[PDB]
Design a protein around this ligand. Sequence first.
Ligand SMILES: O=C(Nc1cncc2ccccc12)[C@@H]1CNCc2ccc(Cl)cc21
Ligand SMILES: [Cl-]
Lengths: 299, 302
Amino acid sequence: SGFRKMAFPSGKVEGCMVQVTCGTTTLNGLWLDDVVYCPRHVICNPNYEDLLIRKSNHNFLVQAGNVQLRVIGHSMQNCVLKLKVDTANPKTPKYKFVRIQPGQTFSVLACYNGSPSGVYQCAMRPNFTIKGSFLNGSCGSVGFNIDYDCVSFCYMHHMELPTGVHAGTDLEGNFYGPFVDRQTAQAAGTDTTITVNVLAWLYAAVINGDRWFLNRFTTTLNDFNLVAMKYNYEPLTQDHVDILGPLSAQTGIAVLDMCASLKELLQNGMNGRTILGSALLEDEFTPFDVVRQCSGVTF
Amino acid sequence: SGFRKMAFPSGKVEGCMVQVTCGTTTLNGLWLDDVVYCPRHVICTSEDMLNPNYEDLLIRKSNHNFLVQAGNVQLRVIGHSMQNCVLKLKVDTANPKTPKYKFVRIQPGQTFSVLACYNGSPSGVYQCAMRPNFTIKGSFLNGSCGSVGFNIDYDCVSFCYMHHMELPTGVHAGTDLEGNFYGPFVDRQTAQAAGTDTTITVNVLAWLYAAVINGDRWFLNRFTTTLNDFNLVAMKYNYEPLTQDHVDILGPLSAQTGIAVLDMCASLKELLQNGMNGRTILGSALLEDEFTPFDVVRQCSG
Ligand SMILES: O=C(Nc1cncc2ccccc12)[C@@H]1CNCc2ccc(Cl)cc21
Ligand SMILES: [Cl-]
């Protein structure tokens, strides 16, 4: 029993964190095989092609623990700088670069000066921001998932927006959301709640003995989406209904039946009651996270 | 900016997780140097669980009865001893991945990271606190026994918890790494109930300071309180008494935000009386008590 915001074990990612210095700027890098990936703003209205051409290999000071790595090449791919090094990381795990969709969750290994300080779980918001916990020096910290023995790198931190939310790229340097890597007026779009994730978390609560919100009613997918759109909730698709199938089978509560519970929860509130120690509806657990935690999958 | 329930990077602890098998029972072990630490109930059956005599059961065991597996490698047990509720299995190989470590026994209110494991394999990491009733509100299924709680301050891993059991209410009980249980719990299937839980007052105050540091001031008020009047109010909401030690510990946060501890105490009294009124504090509609004053400083400063 118990339901916690749980991150993947960070060990495979810790062995890849390095410190990258260029001039006055010091941030984090991801060392995989003989390449160190880091945000391109480490070289900093910036013209990154112009700024990078002026740099030489010895301008980049890469430090892996108490060992200095020597940079033998540098190239830019979108908003990520790829620093070719002489040494291949012996601790390189089996990995992939994956781009995630809004609503998907991942673990963040927050780092400062190439040293991991913490690990937390979070979700890619529908407005493409992440509600992270980042201070100055965290740039280059990465988000990941583990599937079996493979580390899927899905995020690299670049910046904090004026509202305290974070913006970053995939490992190919493509930003999530309509952001750019420069000091300019940028604002996160109006956020929405990840509906499929709230439903998955309602199933996790049922699996844990919390049934007070359940009701005899069901709804059509159309009537649910008309209500959900009114409360700034993401539309629930048939793909989402299909993905919730295993949880629906395990608890004996049809997806549209659980939608009627959510529909009532939105129009009436919790009324002093809590679901899994929370007075708010939680949307940072996907249907897979719930299955993985309530079944105990290992890595 | 931002405030998250953050766990320590689990890497240093992952390299210590092994699977321990004795008869039908399979749980987790902590492999540090040439010793594997695991709950002593690994020697028990379910029929010898109401009133097990562990000295008697252990004397009947030999080294080859304990099957220790570190990854896809079987470790050879060369000795076994019991220290309180923990079994210490001497092995013939010292763990090459043994980090700098300490065994620390924590007090209620303290937080730590849990590396939940099944069959010696890490499945997840989460942050939690030692409840004032000495239980932990973990996320554990059968097979998680032997999973450990830790803090990684600087380069040293401080092991503070080893998971032993789940109480009938879904909460968890375990020991420090010396096998001494936290709380009045025993490693027996006898009737055991967690005492009435209470809110870790010093931690709620620290989390209110974290919210101030992050620009959230709506809950602040022009009032202050005596420590005695605060505790009389706090007790009525099932809140732990705030001591002078707690007031002293909150000193740095009080200095950083310019809000006296007894001033923040008056905010908390008001929150307890009024509720949040549809508002949130650090994205939470409830008062959070699983961040210590030390966690807040570390996350907001370093
Ligand atoms: O509690 C225990 N294990 C678990 C531990 N954690 C989470 C579980 C979740 C679901 C089932 C088991 C779980 C064991 C087994 N049950 C009785 C018992 C009695 C005493 C002792 Cl010390 C251990 C145990
Ligand atoms: Cl302590």
